[PDB]
Amino acid sequence: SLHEKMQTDYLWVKDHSQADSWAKARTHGYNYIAHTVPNKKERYEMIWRSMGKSTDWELEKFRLGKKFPDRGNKRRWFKNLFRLIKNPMGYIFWKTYKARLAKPSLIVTSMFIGFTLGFIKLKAQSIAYSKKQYA
Amino acid sequence: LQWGSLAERPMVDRVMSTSTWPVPYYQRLFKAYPIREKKDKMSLLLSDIDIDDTNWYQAKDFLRGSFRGRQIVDYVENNIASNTYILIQQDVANMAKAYVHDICGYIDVANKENVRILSKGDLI
Amino acid sequence: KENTGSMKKPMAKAYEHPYNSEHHPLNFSAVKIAETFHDFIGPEQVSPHYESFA
Amino acid sequence: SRIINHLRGDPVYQDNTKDVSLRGTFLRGKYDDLPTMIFFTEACDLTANWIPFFTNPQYDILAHRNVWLLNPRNFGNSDRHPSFDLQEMSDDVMRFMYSQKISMATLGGHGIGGKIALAVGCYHAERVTGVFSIDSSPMDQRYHEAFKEFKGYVNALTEINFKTWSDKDVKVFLKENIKDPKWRSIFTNNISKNAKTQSDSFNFEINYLNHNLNFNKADSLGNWAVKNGIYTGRAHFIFPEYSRWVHLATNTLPMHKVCARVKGFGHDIFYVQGDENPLNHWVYDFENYANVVASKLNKFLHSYDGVHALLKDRTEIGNFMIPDRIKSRNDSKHIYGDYSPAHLHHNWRFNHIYEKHDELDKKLN
Numbered sequence: 106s107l108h109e110k111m112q113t114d115y116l117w118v119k120d121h122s123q124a125d126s127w128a129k130a131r132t133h134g135y136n137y138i139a140h141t142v143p144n145k146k147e148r149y150e151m152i153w154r155s156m157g158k159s160t161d162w163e164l165e166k167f168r169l170g171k172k173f174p175d176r177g178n179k180r181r182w183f184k185n186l187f188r189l190i191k192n193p194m195g196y197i198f199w200k201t202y203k204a205r206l207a208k209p210s211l212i213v214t215s216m217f218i219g220f221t222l223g224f225i226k227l228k229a230q231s232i233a234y235s236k237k238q239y240a
Numbered sequence: 241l242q243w244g245s246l247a248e249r250p251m252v253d254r255v256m257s258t259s260t261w262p263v264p265y266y267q268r269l270f271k272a273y274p275i276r277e278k279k280d281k282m283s284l285l286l287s288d289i290d291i292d293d294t295n296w297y298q299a300k301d302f303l304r305g306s307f308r309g310r311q312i313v314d315y316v317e318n319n320i321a322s323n324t325y326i327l328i329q330q331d332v333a334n335m336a337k338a339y340v341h342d343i344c345g346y347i348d349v350a351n352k353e354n355v356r357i358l359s360k361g362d363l364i
Numbered sequence: 365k366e367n368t369g370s371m372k373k374p375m376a377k378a379y380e381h382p383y384n385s386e387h388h389p390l391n392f393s394a395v396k397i398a399e400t401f402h403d404f405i406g407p408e409q410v411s412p413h414y415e416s417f418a
Numbered sequence: 419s420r421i422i423n424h425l426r427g428d429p430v431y432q433d434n435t436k437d438v439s440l441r442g443t444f445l446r447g448k449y450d451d452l453p454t455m456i457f458f459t460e461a462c463d464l465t466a467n468w469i470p471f472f473t474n475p476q477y478d479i480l481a482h483r484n485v486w487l488l489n490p491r492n493f494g495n496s497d498r499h500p501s502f503d504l505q506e507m508s509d510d511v512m513r514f515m516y517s518q519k520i521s522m523a524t525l526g527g528h529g530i531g532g533k534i535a536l537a538v539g540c541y542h543a544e545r546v547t548g549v550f551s552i553d554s555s556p557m558d559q560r561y562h563e564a565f566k567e568f569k570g571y572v573n574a575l576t577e578i579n580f581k582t583w584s585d586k587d588v589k590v591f592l593k594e595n596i597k598d599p600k601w602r603s604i605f606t607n608n609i610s611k612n613a614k615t616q617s618d619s620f621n622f623e624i625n626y627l628n629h630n631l632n633f634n635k636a637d638s639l640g641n642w643a644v645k646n647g648i649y650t651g652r653a654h655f656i657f658p659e660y661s662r663w664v665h666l667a668t669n670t671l672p673m674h675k676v677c678a679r680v681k682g683f684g685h686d687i688f689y690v691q692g693d694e695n696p697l698n699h700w701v702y703d704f705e706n707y708a709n710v711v712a713s714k715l716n717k718f719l720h721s722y723d724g725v726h727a728l729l730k731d732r733t734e735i736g737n738f739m740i741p742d743r744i745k746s747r748n749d750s751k752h753i754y755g756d757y758s759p760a761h762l763h764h765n766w767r768f769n770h771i772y773e774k775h776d777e778l779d780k781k782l783n
């Protein structure tokens with residue numbers, strides 16, 4: 106009885122007044138899924154639970170209703186591109202912060218730079234040899 | 241001015257939020273500090289410093305802000321034989337002396353009254 | 365008697381150094397270099413999304 | 419008297435898992451209006467033992483929140499039901515919160531209690547502000563030595579028959595069968611004599627419990643199932659350095675695996691400096707362990723509990739603006755921008771504080 110008593114209670118299930126004005130996630134998480142994380146199966150359970158609350162665990166309403174994408178991820182590639190152009194050093198710095206916490210040795214860092222700059226130096230010579238072939 | 245209810249705490253401590261699914265993945269690394277302003281907050285360096293000269297110097301500064309405190313300062317810095325203003329009480333010698341020298345002074349008060357009452361008339 | 369107390373007029377100002385400012389500090393430290401650094405790389409780019417961009 | 423108020427009732431065996439009511443002790447706070455805290459004691463362990471921790475002036479936890487020391491089903495005074503499904507046991511708390519008119523609460527637990535607290539946040543996250551787990555982890559403990567002893571002791575307790583056995587026969591049975599001093603003391607105090615001294619029995623359902631543990635399957639209390647899902651809110655974990663229940667080597671990964679917002683060691687996961695002692699599980703007994711838990715507990719309640727995910731601390735409420743996802747609002751003529759997320763009152767549903775303040779706001783204008 107107490108279970109149904111609270112389900113029917115309007116106060117127990119009532120959106121706040123500003124709830125309409127708030128930003129609302131219009132997806133249950135089935136649009137972009139994490140496939141290789143160790144909590145993969147735990148993620149699916151929360152998607153399944155969210156889909157059930159929307160339909161009172163009568164998923165026939167979901168099968169009949171409209172399915173929508175995650176319109177919040179729209180134009181996300183363009184937006185990150187403009188942020189990289191605005192401040193590339195800041196975009197690169199923060200996107201690589203957690204990776205740079207583990208810093209390799211001076212030797213490895215030097216090998217990276219040396220082989221990278223050496224590859225660029227040979228690329229420049231091949232560009233010059235092409236101007237020699239054009240002449 | 242308005243003070244509110246003494247019992248109630250600030251609304252910040254009472255106002256709460258809850259999570260839901262989906263969740264943002266991003267884990268905050270640092271606190272935002274766009275503007276370098278930390279005014280009206282005292283330094284945390286003043287944490288575990290032992291008693292020193294700043295204690296009696298700041299005491300006088302605050303005592304001199306009151307009428308009764310000004311009397312204590314003038315009397316202490318002039319009429320107390322101490323080699324330092326950092327007063328540390330480890331014995332009650334100076335305290336008992338001042339009590340026995342005072343509570344004893346009020347002796348003979350009753351015997352004095354008996355003299356007057358008894359010298360008034362002779363029973364016989 | 366305490367309520368009758370008053371307050372003396374304090375000094376107007378102390379010395380103002382003509383060559384030290386908050387933006388151009390005279391002496392050097394790693395704290396000011398840190399402020400200029402985090403202003404360059406900008407603040408932490410917090411993502412509001414539920415999955416990473418990559 | 420006043421600060422200590424524990425509702426009194428009799429356990430009722432229930433055939434339906436939804437008609438289950440929870441009973442426990444309530445500790446009133448110093449201040450008038452404070453959010454509520456729901457704390458689950460160790461399995462088969464008394465709620466009273468945690469009273470001195472939450473009622474110590476040195477810690478001053480009640481200054482922050484009102485505490486509900488609640489017993490799960492089949493434990494203490496709460497109703498009895500053979501199922502121990504964390505989803506069912508979590509709904510029990512939601513009905514308790516409804517009957518007591520609690521919109522959302524802070525959840526805590528010790529050992530297996532920590533699991534029960536986290537399950538509620540996993541099944542009901544919109545109504546849980548935070549979780550504070552003590553010497554527990556969302557993990558399968560069926561093969562942990564500490565759990566086996568508890569699992570073993572509960573099985574031994576099924577051999578005693580109070581009807582035939584005398585009071586002395588019991589005391590001799592516990593000392594020999596129960597080696598751990600604390601578990602022994604906990605079980606002795608759990609024995610109670612019903613009205614009219616008809617017979618003595620355990621406050622907890624020994625039969626339903628042994629089947630859960632002895633079967634040693636997914637529904638076992640030592641087990642943490644994938645069905646429980648993920649907790650979306652604030653979570654802080656505190657456990658002893660040398661703990662039989664949570665090993666620092668690998669038993670910390672489940673926290674990241676189950677709690678999405680857990681940052682990691684030193685931020686949401688701490689270990690208490692201590693020696694190897696099987697009694698360290700009971701932090702409230704040793705001042706050194708308790709003093710650290712209390713400080714960390716008061717810090718979680720004051721600055722981290724009930725704070726939006728993308729905000730660092732409670733200090734950022736009202737001064738840090740979160741980015742908004744495009745096409746997330748119904749209004750079409752909306753210029754998308756950063757916003758500070760809404761943090762509501764702890765019991766805004768069962769009061770009219772918003773309706774009242776709206777009127778006061780109009781009087782200003």
Ligand SMILES: CCCCCCCCCCCCCCCCCC(=O)OC[C@H](COP(=O)([O-])OCC(O)COP(=O)([O-])OC[C@@H](COC(=O)CCCCCCCCCCCCCCCCC)OC(=O)CCCCCCCCCCCCCCCCC)OC(=O)CCCCCCCCCCCCCCCCC
Nearest residue numbers: 174175176177178179180181182183184185186187190745
């Ligand atoms: C009678 C004669 C008629 C003559 C005229 C004939 C013309 C016919 C017109 C009819 C055709 C249009 C039909 C209407 C479409 C309506 C559909 C709709 O509702 O919108 C869907 C679509 C959905 O986008 P969205 O939902 O908002 O979000 C997108 C996602 O988030 C995705 O965004 P993201 O951030 O996640 O990143 C992924 C994104 C971007 O990913 C990328 O990385 C691709 C980037 C491509 C551009 C850059 C190329 C690289 C080279 C340049 C480098 C630039 C960067 C350099 C940076 C600096 C370098 C230092 O992927 C996309 O490509 C998005 C494209 C939109 C989806 C459409 C399906 C595309 C699949 C095919 C892909 C291959 C085609 C690519 C075309 C370009 C698309 C932008 O919106 C549109 O784009 C609508 C476009 C319609 C515009 C019509 C304007 C008027 C047209 C007439 C003007 C006159 C033309 C005259 C021509 C004369 C002859 C030549």
Ligand SMILES: CCCCCCCCCCCCCCCCCC(=O)OC[C@H](COP(=O)([O-])OCC(O)COP(=O)([O-])OC[C@@H](COC(=O)CCCCCCCCCCCCCCCCC)OC(=O)CCCCCCCCCCCCCCCCC)OC(=O)CCCCCCCCCCCCCCCCC
Nearest residue numbers: 183186187188189190191192193194195196197198201404
């Ligand atoms: C993929 C692998 C291969 C990569 C190959 C290399 C890729 C390209 C490399 C290009 C590097 C050039 C660097 C230029 C100087 C940057 C210096 C700087 O401090 O940066 C900040 C600097 C912003 O400082 P700011 O000047 O104070 O502007 C801030 C204002 O608030 C801005 O006011 P606002 O917020 O109102 O504006 C909106 C904002 C956002 O809106 C957008 O930018 C999006 C649309 C922009 C149009 C698409 C750009 C197309 C290319 C530009 C035109 C051709 C080149 C122009 C010459 C650029 C070289 C200076 O616009 C901006 O972000 C700044 C304006 C963008 C430039 C647009 C005008 C271009 C014409 C320049 C005229 C003046 C120069 C005279 C002509 C020079 C030639 C003789 O960024 C830029 O200005 C543009 C940087 C572009 C970098 C793109 C690629 C970076 C990442 C490459 C990764 C390489 C791989 C290795 C990574 C390893 C990681 C593990």
Ligand SMILES: CCCCCCCCCCCCCCCCCC(=O)OC[C@H](COP(=O)([O-])OCC(O)COP(=O)([O-])OC[C@@H](COC(=O)CCCCCCCCCCCCCCCCC)OC(=O)CCCCCCCCCCCCCCCCC)OC(=O)CCCCCCCCCCCCCCCCC
Nearest residue numbers: 204205206207208209210213216217218220221222223224
């Ligand atoms: C527009 C132009 C387009 C063309 C060019 C395109 C170029 C694209 C390259 C873009 C970047 C590549 C992807 C990097 C992902 C981001 C960084 C990252 O990996 O996350 C960190 C993560 C682990 O690093 P960590 O988290 O910092 O932990 C390290 C500790 O903190 C401290 O260290 P520890 O104690 O743990 O161990 C010692 C140390 C070991 O010391 C090292 O780090 C070894 C590196 C020594 C220097 C190697 C020379 C520098 C290479 C770049 C210059 C190329 C030279 C010219 C090439 C000419 C021929 C094309 O470990 C490390 O620190 C990291 C080593 C893990 C391997 C790093 C990734 C491979 C090297 C970079 C690939 C470069 C490819 C460029 C060309 C590709 C063309 C198809 O690395 C991984 O992703 C794990 C992946 C598994 C790697 C092991 C097995 C790899 C087997 C395949 C090897 C492929 C070799 C390719 C040779 C290229 C041709 C000769």
Ligand SMILES: CCCCCCCCCCCCCCCCCC(=O)OC[C@H](COP(=O)([O-])OCC(O)COP(=O)([O-])OC[C@@H](COC(=O)CCCCCCCCCCCCCCCCC)OC(=O)CCCCCCCCCCCCCCCCC)OC(=O)CCCCCCCCCCCCCCCCC
Nearest residue numbers: 205206207208209210211212213214215216217218219220
């Ligand atoms: C009074 C007593 C002496 C006091 C001397 C005073 C010392 C003052 C120290 C001042 C410290 C300066 C702090 C600022 C610099 C910090 C930033 C930094 O880069 O440090 C590395 C820093 C720390 O790296 P780490 O992973 O912690 O490893 C630390 C040690 O390497 C340890 O690594 P480990 O534990 O794995 O040990 C293995 C070790 C094993 O090494 C060995 O067992 C034996 C080594 C035998 C060497 C044999 C050489 C044979 C030469 C044959 C060549 C023949 C060709 C000659 C051509 C002639 C032409 C005719 O191998 C290495 O570690 C290789 C390290 C490379 C060292 C290069 C310098 C070697 C000689 C220096 C002599 C200085 C006088 C010392 C006298 C002491 C005598 C007892 O790396 C970073 O993470 C920072 C970013 C680095 C980015 C890479 C680019 C950096 C380059 C620019 C740096 C700034 C400008 C230049 C500064 C000088 C750099 C060499």
Ligand SMILES: CCCCCCCCCCCCCCCCCC(=O)OC[C@H](COP(=O)([O-])OCC(O)COP(=O)([O-])OC[C@@H](COC(=O)CCCCCCCCCCCCCCCCC)OC(=O)CCCCCCCCCCCCCCCCC)OC(=O)CCCCCCCCCCCCCCCCC
Nearest residue numbers: 182185186189196197199200201202203204205416417418
């Ligand atoms: C005419 C038409 C021509 C133009 C057409 C237009 C096309 C323009 C292309 C623009 C494409 C859109 C740009 C979007 C943003 C940039 C790309 C990106 O992935 O950003 C997101 C990516 C992470 O995505 P997120 O989900 O937003 O980050 C979440 C966490 O915060 C991240 O950290 P977490 O650990 O917490 O979470 C996991 C994390 C785990 O993985 C990682 O974190 C990666 C670890 C890297 C850091 C390790 C230390 C190494 C960095 C040291 C700094 C060295 C550079 C600076 C020093 C020299 C000063 C210049 O991220 C991942 O899930 C896997 C990494 C993403 C997949 C692998 C991508 C590898 C290449 C990216 C680096 C570029 C290498 C240079 C290649 C260019 C050759 C010149 O950001 C980065 O990790 C660094 C971005 C820097 C990229 C610069 C190059 C831009 C050009 C993009 C073209 C595509 C790559 C081509 C290379 C091909 C080689 C195989």
